[PDB]
Design a protein around this ligand. Structure first.
Ligand SMILES: [Mg+2]
Ligand SMILES: [Mg+2]
Ligand SMILES: [Mg+2]
Ligand SMILES: [Mg+2]
Ligand SMILES: [Mg+2]
Ligand SMILES: [Mg+2]
Ligand SMILES: [Mg+2]
Ligand SMILES: [Mg+2]
Ligand SMILES: [Mg+2]
Ligand SMILES: [Mg+2]
Ligand SMILES: [Mg+2]
Ligand SMILES: [Mg+2]
Ligand SMILES: [Mg+2]
Ligand SMILES: [Mg+2]
Ligand SMILES: [Mg+2]
Ligand SMILES: [Mg+2]
Ligand SMILES: [Mg+2]
Ligand SMILES: [Mg+2]
Ligand SMILES: [Mg+2]
Ligand SMILES: [Mg+2]
Ligand SMILES: [Mg+2]
Ligand SMILES: [Mg+2]
Ligand SMILES: [Mg+2]
Ligand SMILES: [Mg+2]
Ligand SMILES: [Mg+2]
Ligand SMILES: [Mg+2]
Ligand SMILES: [Mg+2]
Ligand SMILES: [Mg+2]
Ligand SMILES: [Mg+2]
Ligand SMILES: [Mg+2]
Ligand SMILES: [Mg+2]
Ligand SMILES: [Mg+2]
Ligand SMILES: [Mg+2]
Ligand SMILES: [Mg+2]
Ligand SMILES: [Mg+2]
Lengths: 86, 99, 116, 136, 123
RNA sequence: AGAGUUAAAUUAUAACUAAGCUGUAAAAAGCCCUAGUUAAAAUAAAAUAACCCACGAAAGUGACUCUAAUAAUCCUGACACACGAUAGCUAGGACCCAAACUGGGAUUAGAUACCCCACUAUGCCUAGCCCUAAACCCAAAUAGUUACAUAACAAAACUA
């Protein structure tokens, strides 16, 4: 409100395609976590009920990180197998 | 008589030291269509993909140039006691036994 | 990089106080989560609306506007064939990863070890 | 380097639409609320040229929520605005609701030309506490 | 240097500016302060518009005053700065150069944590 | 613990503009001293950083700055001493927003509830009380060891 307007969260559509530029802006906000925050902040969420969220999120992030790594590590051996029908 | 420790101290696998970015010589002992299984002699063979240049030149018995990345592929993962082995080593293909 | 698990979990040794309380133990499972089927939206809605406006202005004589109508059916055929194609499309996978069957075999081939 | 989005308020940038500076192009406020949508098209001078609501467009208590209604309001809004002769519009969406995209499309399809989207959706830095969550 | 004074001042002409700075350092030298240096950072358009003394300002001049002062004092100078009619925002920070540089030796790599769960032959 | 400060948002209150605005699964009631825009103090609460894991004895503590400042050459120890989330009580201020209660509106066989709408004690400050929690990491303190060893499950087993 004290900041200069139109500098923030602004995309300018190129070659007149609107839908593309909107997708772009959406990708911005969702990349920064603002959509999850708006949606979060429609109602309240109590501090306890918040650390639960945090911890469940962070556990899940750890799991998915690890499992991802493991998958991409074992990726090589997806290759068609040499020894078949030994 | 040679003591084992002596055999160890003077071996090439020792002399090489750390595995990263080493320039190694290797041999192709098995082929599946795009994939060439290369024993450079270390413990485990590595795998490669036949390059676009001179495809038919790389055959079983052919000798090859390798840039050795890792002597073997291993890591420990979430809730694991022992780390996990691929039973291969990581290497890159440079040229074929440039002579 | 993977979030540090050091000091996080409530344990006998740990001098700190807990960070993560896992609901299910933190271990890589052997299998992988099955694919998530995506839901649909209302198909064609645009042409529907345009053709509505047309009949509103034209007092509902279908002969007055052929254009909105033919474009409407264009959308209907694009929609139906999009459904047929998304039915045969199961070779889609992740488009650059492998279908969860492959991941699961592959993961049973280099399982994760809790025991021993 | 073509179409860097945020054109500076300094004069180093010459790009004109209808021979106007980006500062002079009309602002269309879109407000997308879960039960509603409203567009108001205003001059760079802040003199309102157009107003359309999902209700003002003759929808009713629930149905006025939908994206249908949004594009509907958008069209007639751009009609009233086009009447006063605005070619180009820089748009701002306020709130996050059903008729965001629909209304923006509604301005285009309604024959009004769009340059920019910027999102001003109020994001508390932890000011006023929200109302309680619901089932409880 | 011990303390640092970030002066954002109402943008004026040169004489008025000079006046303001002068009387500022006078006030400081009166509360017992030793002034090291004066660094003019220019007249900038503020990042955002600041409302003080019933005037809402767009631009401002920027100044940096390094000085030594006794602990008891800082409040006094803050008060006399807040009172002032042409200060568009004051502040006083412990001068950055008292804070030490303790060498990042680098990243100490964190290994995966083991012996979380018991060894159990389950399933 | 003090003292000073405010970026986002919100609200008074004006200027325009349109008649609606709000609200749900769907509605109704409610408000049009309403709504969108443009201005704007106070009060309250502190996005991102945090995928960090620090500080405190615990409760607790994550907007900014400065002042004061974190017991013990360090073993255990009470019915003694000093603290102790929320809510609550006493007196005085504060009041954006939230909100037990209550009154409307739906839902329902009923609906003293879940959903909707207002509005209050109350959350906020200063001073004084009250001394309770799933105050739980349900895992006492201080030195150790990984020897011996699987009731079950959970955070593996044990000495002194
Ligand atoms: Mg404003
Ligand atoms: Mg987060
Ligand atoms: Mg501690
Ligand atoms: Mg605890
Ligand atoms: Mg559990
Ligand atoms: Mg917060
Ligand atoms: Mg309950
Ligand atoms: Mg287990
Ligand atoms: Mg106090
Ligand atoms: Mg403000
Ligand atoms: Mg306002
Ligand atoms: Mg207001
Ligand atoms: Mg609804
Ligand atoms: Mg009514
Ligand atoms: Mg966070
Ligand atoms: Mg924490
Ligand atoms: Mg101590
Ligand atoms: Mg003691
Ligand atoms: Mg208490
Ligand atoms: Mg209280
Ligand atoms: Mg009250
Ligand atoms: Mg008031
Ligand atoms: Mg209220
Ligand atoms: Mg009732
Ligand atoms: Mg019943
Ligand atoms: Mg229910
Ligand atoms: Mg009230
Ligand atoms: Mg409190
Ligand atoms: Mg607790
Ligand atoms: Mg607990
Ligand atoms: Mg107990
Ligand atoms: Mg004890
Ligand atoms: Mg102690
Ligand atoms: Mg022992
Ligand atoms: Mg058993």
């Amino acid at each position: 409100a004290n900041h200069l307007k139109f500098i923030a969260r602004t995309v300018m559509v190129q070659e007149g395609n609107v839908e593309g530029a909107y997708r772009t802006l959406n990708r911005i906000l969702t990349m920064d976590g603002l959509i999850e925050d708006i949606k979060r902040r429609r109602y309240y969420e109590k501090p306890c009920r918040r650390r639960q969220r945090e911890s469940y999120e962070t556990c899940r992030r750890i799991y998915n990180m690890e499992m991802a790594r493991k998958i991409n590590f074992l990726m090589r051996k997806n290759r068609a197998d040499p020894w078949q029908g030994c | 008589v040679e003591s084992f420790a002596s055999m160890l101290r003077h071996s090439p696998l020792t002399q090489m030291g750390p595995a990263k970015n080493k320039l190694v010589i290797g041999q192709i002992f098995h082929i599946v269509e795009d994939d060439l299984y290369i024993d450079f002699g270390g413990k485990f063979h590595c795998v490669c993909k036949r390059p676009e240049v001179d495809g038919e030149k790389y055959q079983k018995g052919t000798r090859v140039r390798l840039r050795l990345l890792d002597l073997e592929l291993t890591s420990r993962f979430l809730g694991a006691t022992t780390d996990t082995t691929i039973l291969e080593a990581d290497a890159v293909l440079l040229g074929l036994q440039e002579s | 990089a993977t979030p540090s698990l050091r000091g996080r979990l409530a344990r006998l040794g740990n001098p700190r106080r807990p960070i993560l309380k896992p609901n299910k133990p933190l271990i890589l499972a052997n299998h992988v989560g099955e694919r998530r089927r995506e839901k649909g939206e209302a198909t064609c809605i645009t042409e529907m609306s345009v053709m509505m406006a047309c009949w509103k202005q034209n007092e509902f004589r279908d002969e007055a506007c052929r254009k909105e109508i033919q474009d409407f059916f264009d959308c209907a055929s694009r929609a139906e064939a999009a459904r047929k194609m998304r039915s045969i499309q199961e070779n889609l996978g992740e488009l650059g990863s492998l279908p969860p069957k492959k991941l699961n075999k592959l993961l049973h081939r280099f399982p994760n070890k809790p025991h021993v | 380097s073509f179409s860097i989005y945020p054109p500076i308020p300094g004069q180093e940038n010459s790009l004109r639409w209808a021979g106007k500076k980006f500062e002079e192009i009309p602002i269309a406020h879109i407000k997308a609320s879960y039960n509603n949508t409203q567009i108001q098209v205003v001059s760079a001078a802040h003199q309102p040229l157009a107003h359309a609501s999902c209700g003002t467009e003759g929808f009713r208590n629930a149905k006025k929520g939908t994206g249908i209604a949004a594009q509907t309001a958008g069209i007639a809004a751009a009609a009233k605005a086009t009447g006063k002769g605005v070619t180009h519009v820089r748009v701002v969406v306020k709130g996050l609701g059903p008729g965001r995209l629909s209304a923006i499309k509604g301005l285009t399809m309604g024959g009004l030309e769009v340059i920019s989207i910027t999102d001003n959706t109020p994001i508390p830095h932890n000011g006023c506490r929200p109302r309680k969550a619901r089932r409880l | 240097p011990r303390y640092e004074l970030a002066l954002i001042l109402k943008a004026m002409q040169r004489p008025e500016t000079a006046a303001a700075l002068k009387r500022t350092l006078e006030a400081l030298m009166d509360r017992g302060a030793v002034v090291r240096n004066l660094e003019n950072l220019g007249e900038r358009m503020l990042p955002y518009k600041i409302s003080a003394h019933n005037q809402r300002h767009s631009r401002g001049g920027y100044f940096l005053v390094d000085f030594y002062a006794p602990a008891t004092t800082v409040e006094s100078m803050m008060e006399h700065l807040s009172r002032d009619i042409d200060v568009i925002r004051p502040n006083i920070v412990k001068h950055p150069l008292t804070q030490e540089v303790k060498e990042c030796e680098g990243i100490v790599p964190v290994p995966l944590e083991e012996k979380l769960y018991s060894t159990k032959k389950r399933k």
